[PDB]
């Protein structure tokens, strides 16, 4: 993309994805590298790459979920919870981000918020495997 | 929008009574048919305090009125995730208008199965009867 196109996207609130600024295959490569860093415990680098990905397309559920995960690892629990809520909203009937928000709320010493998150999963998810995990946390809340 | 602002704010990183006042001013505009003014005030609220279900619901309503159904549905889902079933009911309406009737049906069924609002349940059933 030409500089005028990128500046227009910044000014108009458009994604860089919307103007095809980086080819699709290269973005897939970047996501794959981001995941490799993550799996290898290279958290700082993974964080750079997931921030890059979310700047490129701030509506991509998996890009957002990767950054949220990184923030949870780095104990930035409120920012992780904030991104998980967005990821839930942009996704397709997946309550896993809400489950992870429950974990974050426990770490923020907000157990009633946590309970509400795990209950949202238990009451509405069709994923019984995810429900088992959410129920495990709920059963441990005092 | 509100969502992209929330995501950008996370990448990079007024008292309650007065915020309540500004919400009421937004609703005052809305009730008088000043939808554009109402929208600005709700957008302001959702930039200042995005993770507030009442501000989200008000802005989503405006997008639905303006036939920006996907943006409305996205905001209704944030309101649902943050903690009644009115967001799910309105998401169902949005999905119908988006020509996604199986998505709509799932929303209305969720309302009927979980809501304690008997009037919302009747409304959801009337949509289900038509899908
Ligand atoms: C499962 C699980 C549950 C809890 N809990 O607090 O209930 C903590 C960790 C794990 Cl791995
Ligand atoms: Cl954790
Ligand atoms: Cl709490
Ligand atoms: Cl938005
Ligand atoms: Cl559908
Ligand atoms: Mg491709
Ligand atoms: Mg057991
Ligand atoms: Mg009522």
Q: What is the resolution of this structure in A?
A: 1.7
d(CA B3, CA A58): 9
Cα distances (angstroms) measured from residue B36 to each of A18, B24, B43, B112? 26, 15, 10, 33
d(CA B111, CA B107): 6
Domain map of chain B by residue range? Answer: 1-131
CA A70 vs. chain centroid, Å, equals: 8
> Residue A30 burial (CB < 10 Å; 0-12/13-18/19+)?
middle
- Atom index in ligand 1 nearest the CA of residue A106 equals 6
d(CA B125, CA A1): 49
Answer whether A93 sits within 8 Å of B106, measured CB to CB.
yes
- Interface A-B: count of C-beta contacts within 8 A: 58
Collect all residues of chain A within an 8 Å Cβ-Cβ radius of residue B10: 67, 71, 79, 82-83
d(CA A75, CA B32): 46
């Amino acid at each position: 993309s030409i500089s005028t196109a990128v500046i227009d996207a910044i000014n108009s609130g458009a994604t860089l994805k919307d103007i095809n600024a980086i080819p699709d295959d290269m973005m897939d490569d970047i996501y794959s590298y981001a995941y490799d860093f993550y799996n290898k415990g290279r958290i700082e680098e993974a964080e750079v790459f997931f921030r890059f990905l979310c700047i490129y397309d701030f509506y991509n559920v998996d890009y957002i979920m990767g950054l949220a995960a990184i923030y949870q690892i780095k104990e930035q629990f409120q920012q992780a919870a904030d991104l998980y809520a967005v990821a839930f909203a942009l996704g397709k009937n997946d309550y896993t981000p809400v489950f992870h928000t429950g974990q974050c709320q426990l770490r923020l010493k907000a157990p009633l918020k946590a309970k509400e998150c795990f209950e949202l999963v238990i009451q509405h998810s069709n994923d019984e495997k995810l429900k088992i995990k959410a129920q495990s946390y709920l059963d441990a809340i005092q």
